[PDB]
Each structure stands twice: as structure tokens, then as C-alpha cells.
Amino acid sequence: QFPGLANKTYFNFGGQGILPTVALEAITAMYGYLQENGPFSIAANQHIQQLIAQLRQALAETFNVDPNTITITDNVTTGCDIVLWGLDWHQGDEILLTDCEHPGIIAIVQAIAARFGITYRFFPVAATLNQGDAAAVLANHLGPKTRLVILSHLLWNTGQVLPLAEIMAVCRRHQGNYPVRVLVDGAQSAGSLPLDFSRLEVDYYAFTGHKWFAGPAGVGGLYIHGDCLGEINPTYVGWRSITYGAKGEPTGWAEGGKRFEVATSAYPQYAGLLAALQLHQRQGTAEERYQAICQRSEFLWRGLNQLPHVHCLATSAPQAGLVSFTVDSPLGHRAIVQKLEEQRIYLRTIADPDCIRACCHYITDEEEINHLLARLADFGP
Amino acid sequence: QFPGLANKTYFNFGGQGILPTVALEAITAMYGYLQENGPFSIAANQHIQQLIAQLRQALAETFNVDPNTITITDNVTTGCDIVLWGLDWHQGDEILLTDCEHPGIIAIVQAIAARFGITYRFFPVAATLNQGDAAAVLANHLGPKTRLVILSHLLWNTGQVLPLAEIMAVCRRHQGNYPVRVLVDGAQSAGSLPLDFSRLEVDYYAFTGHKWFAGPAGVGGLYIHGDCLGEINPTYVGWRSITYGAKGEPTGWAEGGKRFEVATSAYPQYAGLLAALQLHQRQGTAEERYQAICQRSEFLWRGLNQLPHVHCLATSAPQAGLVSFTVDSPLGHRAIVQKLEEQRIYLRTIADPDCIRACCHYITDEEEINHLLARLADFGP
Numbered sequence: 068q069f070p071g072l073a074n075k076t077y078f079n080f081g082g083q084g085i086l087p088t089v090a091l092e093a094i095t096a097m098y099g100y101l102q103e104n105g106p107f108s109i110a111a112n113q114h115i116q117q118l119i120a121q122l123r124q125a126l127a128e129t130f131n132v133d134p135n136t137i138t139i140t141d142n143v144t145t146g147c148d149i150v151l152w153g154l155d156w157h158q159g160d161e162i163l164l165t166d167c168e169h170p171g172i173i174a175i176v177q178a179i180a181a182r183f184g185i186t187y188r189f190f191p192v193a194a195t196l197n198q199g200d201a202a203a204v205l206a207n208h209l210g211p212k213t214r215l216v217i218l219s220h221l222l223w224n225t226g227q228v229l230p231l232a233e234i235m236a237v238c239r240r241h242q243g244n245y246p247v248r249v250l251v252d253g254a255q256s257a258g259s260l261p262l263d264f265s266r267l268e269v270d271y272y273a274f275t276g277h278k279w280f281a282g283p284a285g286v287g288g289l290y291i292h293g294d295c296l297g298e299i300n301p302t303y304v305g306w307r308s309i310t311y312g313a314k315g316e317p318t319g320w321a322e323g324g325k326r327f328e329v330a331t332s333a334y335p336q337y338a339g340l341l342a343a344l345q346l347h348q349r350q351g352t353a354e355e356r357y358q359a360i361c362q363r364s365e366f367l368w369r370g371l372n373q374l375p376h377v378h379c380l381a382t383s384a385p386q387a388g389l390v391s392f393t394v395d396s397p398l399g400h401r402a403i404v405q406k407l408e409e410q411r412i413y414l415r416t417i418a419d420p421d422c423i424r425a426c427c428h429y430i431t432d433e434e435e436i437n438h439l440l441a442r443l444a445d446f447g448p
Numbered sequence: 449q450f451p452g453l454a455n456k457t458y459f460n461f462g463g464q465g466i467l468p469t470v471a472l473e474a475i476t477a478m479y480g481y482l483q484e485n486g487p488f489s490i491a492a493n494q495h496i497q498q499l500i501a502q503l504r505q506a507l508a509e510t511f512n513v514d515p516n517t518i519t520i521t522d523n524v525t526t527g528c529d530i531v532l533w534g535l536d537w538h539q540g541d542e543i544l545l546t547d548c549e550h551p552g553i554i555a556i557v558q559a560i561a562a563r564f565g566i567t568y569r570f571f572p573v574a575a576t577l578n579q580g581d582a583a584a585v586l587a588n589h590l591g592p593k594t595r596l597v598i599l600s601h602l603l604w605n606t607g608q609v610l611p612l613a614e615i616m617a618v619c620r621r622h623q624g625n626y627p628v629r630v631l632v633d634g635a636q637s638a639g640s641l642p643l644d645f646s647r648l649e650v651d652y653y654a655f656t657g658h659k660w661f662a663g664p665a666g667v668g669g670l671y672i673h674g675d676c677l678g679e680i681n682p683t684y685v686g687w688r689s690i691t692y693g694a695k696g697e698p699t700g701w702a703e704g705g706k707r708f709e710v711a712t713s714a715y716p717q718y719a720g721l722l723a724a725l726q727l728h729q730r731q732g733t734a735e736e737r738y739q740a741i742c743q744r745s746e747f748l749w750r751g752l753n754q755l756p757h758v759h760c761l762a763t764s765a766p767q768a769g770l771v772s773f774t775v776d777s778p779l780g781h782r783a784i785v786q787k788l789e790e791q792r793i794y795l796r797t798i799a800d801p802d803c804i805r806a807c808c809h810y811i812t813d814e815e816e817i818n819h820l821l822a823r824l825a826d827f828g829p
């Protein structure tokens with residue numbers, strides 16, 4: 068089902084997932100349906116709306132929530148933009164971010180700091196990979212003017228799974244000027260960690276379909292708890308954001324998460340993500356998949372611990388699919404990732420901390436891991 | 449080149465254009481390249497950057513401007529959102545829009561009005577299709593606090609091509625608290641009218657690739673004149689919006705239009721738009737295609753004038769590919785458009801004014817028009 072795995076040794080699922088055949092087929096089929104019936108017509112427009120509804124519903128079931136809490140976007144970042152720009156920011160309001168957030172999210176925060184006179188600071192979580200408590204660290208920085216905390220559930224650089232429940236509790240418990248809310252960047256967590264927003268209390272959770280869920284680049288989504296929807300004012304809007312009157316005039320916002328959806332999107336892509344989501348559900352529960360992922364990452368991590376010139380950032384087994392490490396070599400990590408790609412082995416260079424990252428998915432096998440280990444063994448001081 | 453045309457009588461290019469074979473081949477080829485070489489890898493990441501540059505350059509050439517003035521988006525609306533959310537609004541600032549604008553664009557204006565305390569007022573252009581002067585109407589509405597004027601170069605409802613150069617002169621001649629700027633919604637104009645932004649002076653021009661350009665749904669763009677770039681602050685941003693520091697940290701805004709590009713997008717669809725753009729240039733110059741479009745629209749317009757129960761809104765030949773008309777019948781335009789679709793004849797119901805719209809492209813032929821005419825003859829009072 069994942070053709071792309073053959074003839075390469077892929078560990079970059081956290082960059083982009085390998086697109087399954089069923090997903091490509093659905094994308095191709097959707098273009099065919101539009102050619103045959105439209106592309107712009109009563110039949111085609113209806114089919115597109117039915118497809119959007121099917122995808123919204125599939126995402127809702129994925130996280131065990133009502134479809135009205137799901138917004139379809141193009142990527143992780145957009146979800147973050149929706150939440151951040153939607154909040155009614157007042158000068159001096161404060162935003163706390165872990166020191167392991169994505170450059171693009173930081174950039175939104177900076178744009179918002181400059182726009183509403185808000186402030187932001189980082190709390191050190193990187194250092195808690197092997198010790199400490201990121202929740203305790205957060206508390207330590209929580210203030211009276213803190214309004215929003217931004218954190219990645221699974222860190223893209225170190226592979227740490229942040230203690231989300233305790234960080235939420237720490238946040239509820241807090242008594243300040245604002246009820247502290249938490250925007251979660253789920254780029255790495257969604258599709259790898261089992262996520263249930265019924266059993267797990269979340270405020271905002273942005274994710275994408277193109278990484279661990281293995282859908283095509285260009286389709287992602289955003290979860291907003293019903294109790295937080297009101298606080299989020301639509302910002303980028305368009306014809307998909309509203310309801311219409313008798314003369315075709317705007318008459319209010321569309322139902323639930325639809326108000327944050329803009330206008331024409333690559334619909335066939337939606338069918339691709341739908342197919343990819345349905346495939347993963349065909350392969351055991353989220354929990355069984357997560358355990359499969361950890362068994363692969365621990366096997367790789369254990370393998371790396373045995374190589375004399377490789378040093379894993381994690382001193383205990385990885386809590387998810389991300390395994391970061393450094394290599395003792397004059398070459399530098401970029402040259403090593405490049406040479407590895409020369410041999411059709413795909414890993415990623417991490418900018419901070421300066422290291423290399425490997426992603427193991429439930430479709431990764433030991434043979435691919437042993438291959439990586441054999442070629443990594445070639446580097447040294 | 450446009451397989452979708454056979455076996456239907458399509459007049460809905462203004463809704464979505466028929467996708468040419470070369471575009472579907474480029475889309476498919478891009479998924480294949482990602483499968484073979486990535487999808488996330490040095491080779492794949494470079495191939496995508498090269499693709500984005502090629503598309504940005506082809507758009508730049510289409511409008512005869514420098515690539516730095518072009519932002520790639522997913523649709524017309526996003527271009528309007530970028531400009532509107534980026535201007536430094538102050539309470540009391542006023543926006544004028546024609547009474548023929550898209551409901552989605554009015555929705556952004558109301559959100560801005562609500563967020564920055566600006567005000568908006570409509571000016572009547574719909575009634576200027578056959579008489580009067582849209583620029584003069586705008587002159588009679590310009591005020592002391594007028595900062596921006598929003599208008600569609602080609603009206604999606606009546607098919608009128610507004611006198612843009614004259615409107616620009618009017619705005620530039622006006623003396624008030626602000627240099628009056630103009631945001632053009634080019635959803636119908638781009639890809640049908642020949643547009644040269646070095647000959648035609650323009651401030652902000654939003655467009656999409658999925659209508660007259662015949663690209664796939666999900667890719668569009670925005671033009672911003674070099675002297676206005678400084679006035680548009682980035683709003684929705686992400687990793688594609690910035691320049692980077694030695695440690696992977698954000699250090700500024702990316703060059704030119706890139707500052708308004710966010711994050712992961714439907715890259716194979718970009719190759720699709722690129723191939724469609726190239727196909728049109730191979731058919732003839734923008735001017736030749738425009739003349740062919742008008743030849744078709746006038747032939748259609750003429751035929752409709754001969755039918756006793758059909759009444760074209762335009763009393764002189766259409767200035768572009770859009771031909772709107774009403775039908776004297778107890779059925780109602782929506783029911784008529786549905787009956788036509790049942791016969792695989794594709795038109796669009798217009799909410800205001802209450803009419804039907806047909807779109808003729810350079811690929812439309814006489815047999816299709818005559819067949820449409822044949823079927824409309826059946827409706828009567």
C-alpha cells in the first residue's frame with residue numbers, strides 16, 4: 068500500500084509521509100469526477116460539499132469529537148494563524164512558548180507582538196528530555212498577564228512527548244488576569260500518538276494530514292473546543308465562511324469550524340487525505356499503531372546506542388517515533404544527511420539542537436533500521 | 449487539449465475552467481516525483497522550490513511585472529485577505545466597494561470593519577452596464593476618510609468590464625486624508641482580458657488560476673505594486689514567510705511576495721497551474737485569445753437577442769466572455785439552470801441581479817452556442 072517505501076530507506080515521515088496508493092487513487096478519481104460532471108456545476112459543487120463533510124467527519128472521529136469543532140485547513144501553521152489572529156489581544160498580554168517551537172509559529176507570534184503590543188517569552192523544555200518537568204517549568208513562568216501558552220505535543224527537534232495533561236492542569240489551576248488557554252502544535256503528534264479530545268481536555272489543537280497521517284501536502288486541520296470557539300474571531304474569511312440570505316448577501320457565520328475556512332481549495336486533495344485516514348484505521352487501533360511505532364523507535368534507538376560514534380539525545384527509550392542523535396565526525400550533520408540521501412536513506416538535519424532526526428513509523432521495518440545503522444556506522448572521528 | 453469539453457456543453461469557465469490534459473499530466477508527474485525521490489528530502493525539497501519559482505515567474509510574465517511583486521495563494525479571496533488584513537487601518541477609515549462584489553469579499557470587509565473600527569459604503573455600478581460611467585459614480589462617493597476602493601475588474605454578475613484606468617485616475621486625483629488605493633478582484637478578468645501591469649497602473653490585483661486560466665482548484669495569486677508592498681504587513685505567516693538565522697530562527701520577512709506565503713501547499717497543483725499557463729501562451733497571445741473570447745460571446749449574445757423570451761442584460765456586445773440574461777418564464781432562473789444541467793448544458797444562476805450567466809472561452813465553439821440557443825428556445829411566458 069505504500070509504494071514509495073520500496074528502493075529507499077525512509078525515516079522522514081515527520082517531514083512528509085509516504086502517500087499510500089489508495090490516496091493517490093482517490094485524488095486521481097476526484098479529478099475524473101470533476102472533469103465528467105463539471106468542474107463547476109450543481110452536481111460537482113454538491114459532490115465537493117459532500118466530500119468536505121466526509122473529511123470533516125473522518126477527522127472528528129479520529130479525535131473523538133463533534134464535527135462542529137473541526138476546521139479544514141491546508142497545513143499545521145494555518146491552524147495556528149487562525150487561533151493566534153482570532154484572539155482579542157490587548158497590549159501587554161503575554162504569550163509563553165516552549166523553546167522547541169517551529170520557526171514559522173514563532174514568526175506568527177512576532178507578527179502579533181508587533182500588531183497588538185503583546186509580549187512573549189520561552190520556557191525551557193528541551194532540557195527536560197531526560198530530566199526535569201516541563202509542567203513545573205511552565206508553572207515557574209506562568210504569570211498574571213499570561214493569556215496563551217503554545218507548545219508542541221511531540222517536539223519536532225528532540226522527540227520529547229510533552230506532559231500535556233499536567234500542563235493543562237497547571238494552566239487551569241492558575242489564577243491570573245486571564246483563564247490561561249493552550250494552543251497545541253500537533254504536527255508530529257497527530258497520527259502517531261493516540262489522541263482523544265473527549266478523554267483529553269484540549270483548547271486548540273492544530274495538525275496536518277501530510278506527515279504521520281500520510282495524506283498529500285496541502286490538507287490539514289484545526290480542533291477548537293466548543294468552549295473556546297467564541298473567543299476566536301474569524302480573520303481570513305471568504306465565501307466558505309458565511310451563511311447567505313435571499314439575495315445572496317452575507318447573513319452570519321457558517322456553522323462551527325466552517326467560519327474559519329476561506330474559499331476555493333484543492334478538493335481532490337481532500338479525497339486523498341480521506342483515503343489515507345481510512346487506511347490507517349484499517350490497520351488496528353491508534354493505540355496498537357502507537358505501540359508498533361515505539362517498538363520500531365526503540366529498536367533504532369537501541370541500535371544507535373551501540374554505535375560508538377553516535378549519541379542519542381534521549382537517555383531512555385523514545386516516547387514516540389522521533390529519534391534524534393548526534394554523530395562524532397569532522398563532516399558535520401548536514402554533510403552526513405546529504406551523503407545518506409546519496410544512498411537513498413532519508414533523514415533530516417535539525418537546526419537546534421544541531422543534530423540529525425530519524426522518524427520510525429508503524430510501516431517501518433527492522434531491515435530498514437538495520438540498513439540505516441549499517442551506513443551510519445561508516446562515519447566517525 | 450481540453451478533453452472535458454466533449455460530451456457536455458460547458459459555459460461555466462467563470463465558475464471553474466475545464467482542466468487541460470497537460471495540467472493533469474503535470475499534477476500526476478509531481479506526485480510521482482515526490483514518491484520516487486522523497487516526499488521529504490533534499491532532492492524533493494529543491495524540486496518543489498524550483499517549481500514554486502517557475503510558477504512565480506510565469507505569473508510575473510503573464511502580467512509583465514517583476515516576480516518580486518507576485519505572491520502565490522490558493523484562490524482569489526486569500527489575495528484580498530492579505531491586503532485587507534495588512535493595511536494599517538484606523539477607526540473612521542472608509543472603504544468603498546461596488547454593488548457588484550463577491551459576498552466572500554464583503555465578508556472580509558465586515559470583519560475588518562469590526563476589528564479596526566473602519567466603515568464601508570457601496571457605490572452602484574451594476575446599472576452602468578449600458579449607460580452612465582462607473583468612474584463618475586465613484587467620484588460622487590469619494591470622501592475625506594476614503595482609504596481603499598474595492599472593485600472587480602470584470603463583474604461576475606453582469607459581465608461589465610469596469611473602466612479601470614479611468615477609475616485609477618479618479619482615485620489618484622482625489623485629495624483627502626489618504627492617497628486612495630484600489631484593490632482589484634480579478635477573478636473574471638485574469639486569463640480572459642489581456643492584462644499588463646506596466647502599461648495599466650495598478651495597486652493590488654488578486655486572482656486565481658482555476659477559472660479562466662484553467663488551472664486546478666487550489667492555486668491563485670496576488671499582485672502588489674512595488675511601492676505599495678511596504679504598506680501591507682504580513683498577517684497569516686509561517687515558515688515560508690521568513691528569512692532564517694544561523695540557528696534556524698526567524699530573522700525577517702522573505703523577499704517580495706514570499707512574505708505573504710504561509711506553509712505547506714498543494715505543490716503538485718502548482719505544476720498544474722504552470723502547465724495551463726504555458727498552454728495558453730502556445731495557443732496565441734493574450735490579445736488574440738481575448739478577441740476570440742469576444743467573437744464567441746458576441747455570437748452567443750446575438751443569438752440570445754433573437755430569442756423572443758430571452759433578454760440579455762447588455763444592450764451592446766459583451767466586453768468579455770460573460771453574457772448574463774433573464775428568461776421570461778414561470779419557471780425561475782434556478783429551475784431553468786437545473787433543467788439545462790439535466791441536458792449537460794452548464795450555466796450559472798446569478799443571485800443579484802436575478803439572472804443566468806454563460807461564459808464563453810476561446811475554446812468554446814459555435815455548435816455549443818447553437819445547442820445552448822436551441823435548448824433555451826423552449827422556455828416562454
Ligand SMILES: *Cc1c(COP(=O)(O)O)cnc(C)c1O
Binds near residue numbers: 254712
Ligand atoms: C511540520 C511542522 C510544522 C509546519 O507544518 P505545516 O503543515 O507546513 O504548517 C509546524 N510545527 C512543527 C512542530 C512541525 O514539525
Ligand SMILES: *Cc1c(COP(=O)(O)O)cnc(C)c1O
Binds near residue numbers: 668
Ligand atoms: C469566483 C470569484 C471569487 C472567488 O474566488 P476563489 O478563488 O474561490 O476565492 C471572488 N470574486 C469574484 C468576482 C469571483 O467571480
Ligand SMILES: [K+]
Binds near residue numbers: 371376
Ligand atoms: K552510542
Ligand SMILES: [K+]
Binds near residue numbers: 753754755756758759
Ligand atoms: K431577445
